[PDB]
Design a protein around this ligand. Structure first.
Ligand SMILES: CC1(C)S[C@H]([C@H](NC(=O)COc2cccc3ccccc23)C(=O)O)N[C@H]1C(=O)O
Ligand SMILES: CC1(C)S[C@H]([C@H](NC(=O)COc2cccc3ccccc23)C(=O)O)N[C@H]1C(=O)O
Ligand SMILES: [Zn+2]
Ligand SMILES: [Zn+2]
Ligand SMILES: [Zn+2]
Ligand SMILES: [Zn+2]
Lengths: 240, 239
């Protein structure tokens, strides 16, 4: 309803149980789930849902298994196609807290190899499959089969050392996950697992890997313009 | 590098685990941080005011040890006695450090209601209770020798007991957790909030100190009066 961190509800948003869904393009929706800390309030976290042909691809879980099952129920009701796979963008609760729910549903899960290696140490269940990346950041094609329009890019360490990003070919949309903050943000969020030396280059690498995208989607704000990339990089420049 | 709260900047002095910023010749902002695993540091701001040969404090830090650090900083940088502290409602970021003030012999004041809620909020009550008139102004007999501290209860908002403090002889007024900055996305923790009256209460604070141009608040750097108006606009949507 009214998050302490993350974007507020707005027109075009549809509420479904404890979640909020927003259509970004004919075949792309943003999913939002909330972690309610008592004495603090709710923290919104955003992922994506993509319809590619006759299947659904998910980017990021919700905070919990129950919330992620609710995402799968919303897909069932609104899209009514099989969910082929999910990619999770790093090993923290807001992006991988729901992995058990995906596995129980028979959905194949993919994450950066480093995310799977860090998962147990971060309290997460590892994905079933590991993505690896070239030196230029692009996913090694053989590790990401049947990804449809998803273009998976590892920009370098920033918010975490394992954070990855996803563009949707054929759309105006690129997803920065927790690496990218909105153009009006005052801070870079939780830096406790962050690489302050490389953060700025990582944000600029994300921008150069998805040069066309005009809708920048991120974990804790509403979709923004490319000004979110420039602003994130400039706040990061001050960390070094 | 706080997850919540302002970042460091020129003019910010680090002292132990805290940060101090001079806002005026006789007014400083104290900032302390609560690290919460999985989320990072949350900053919380209060004020320190010099009034002649004595010092006055608004709000503790999150913890006793942090609050004792504030007293150490005052001792080092000002070297005058703290006559009294006013705490602005019964939550940890504003009253978490009561025990440290009391160990130091400092007289503590809170809204009577804050003192009544403190036990239920895991807090230690101030030793003196402020009471308020029907228009929100503190009853002067309950705020003796407050010097420039002009205490105002704006109405329920962030909590039912939240109070605010204007600094007479300056253009500074302190909204505590009632007021969020002009660029804020949300009203923060609404769990204990009065959503029906929040908007009126924020505007009441602005009306009580109509000439204060620097608005200080618990979780953002000092701001303009657009902090007040934006906070009220957000609260209008709660009704
Ligand atoms: C600042 C963030 C929005 S919190 C998030 C991530 N946290 C977790 O998934 C774990 O979630 C938590 C656990 C325990 C208490 C919590 C209290 C409040 C909120 C979350 C809590 C993280 O640590 O990076 N990503 C950051 C960011 O994108 O910058
Ligand atoms: C959102 C706030 C900045 S937290 C604050 C107040 N919190 C507490 O003193 C209790 O402390 C906590 C407990 C549990 C988790 C926490 C995580 C992060 C920070 C504090 C936490 C409150 O309850 O209002 N005032 C709010 C606001 O002004 O809007
Ligand atoms: Zn994270
Ligand atoms: Zn995040
Ligand atoms: Zn509070
Ligand atoms: Zn607060």
């Amino acid at each position: 309803i009214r998050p302490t961190i993350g974007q507020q509800m707005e027109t075009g948003d549809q509420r479904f149980g404890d979640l909020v869904f927003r259509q970004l393009a004919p075949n792309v929706w943003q999913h939002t789930s909330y972690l309610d800390m008592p004495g603090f309030g709710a923290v919104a976290s955003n992922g994506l849902i993509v319809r590619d042909g006759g299947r659904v691809l998910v980017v990021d879980t919700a905070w919990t298994d129950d919330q992620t099952a609710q995402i799968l129920n919303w897909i069932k009701q609104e899209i009514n196609l099989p969910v082929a796979l999910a990619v999770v963008t790093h090993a923290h609760q807001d992006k991988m807290g729901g992995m058990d729910a995906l596995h129980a549903a028979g959905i194949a899960t993919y994450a950066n190899a480093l995310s799977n290696q860090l998962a147990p140490q971060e309290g997460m269940v590892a994905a079933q499959h590991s993505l690896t990346f070239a030196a230029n950041g692009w996913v090694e094609p053989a590790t990401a089969p049947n990804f449809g329009p998803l273009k998976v890019f590892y920009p370098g360490p920033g918010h975490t050392s394992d954070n990855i990003t996803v563009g949707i070919d054929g759309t105006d949309i690129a997803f920065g996950g927790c690496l990218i903050k909105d153009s009006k943000a005052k801070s870079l969020g939780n830096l406790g697992d962050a690489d302050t030396e490389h953060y700025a280059a990582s944000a600029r690498a994300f921008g150069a890997a998805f040069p066309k995208a005009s809708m920048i989607v991120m974990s804790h704000s509403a979709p923004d313009s490319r000004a979110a990339i420039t602003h994130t990089a400039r706040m990061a420049d001050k960390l070094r």
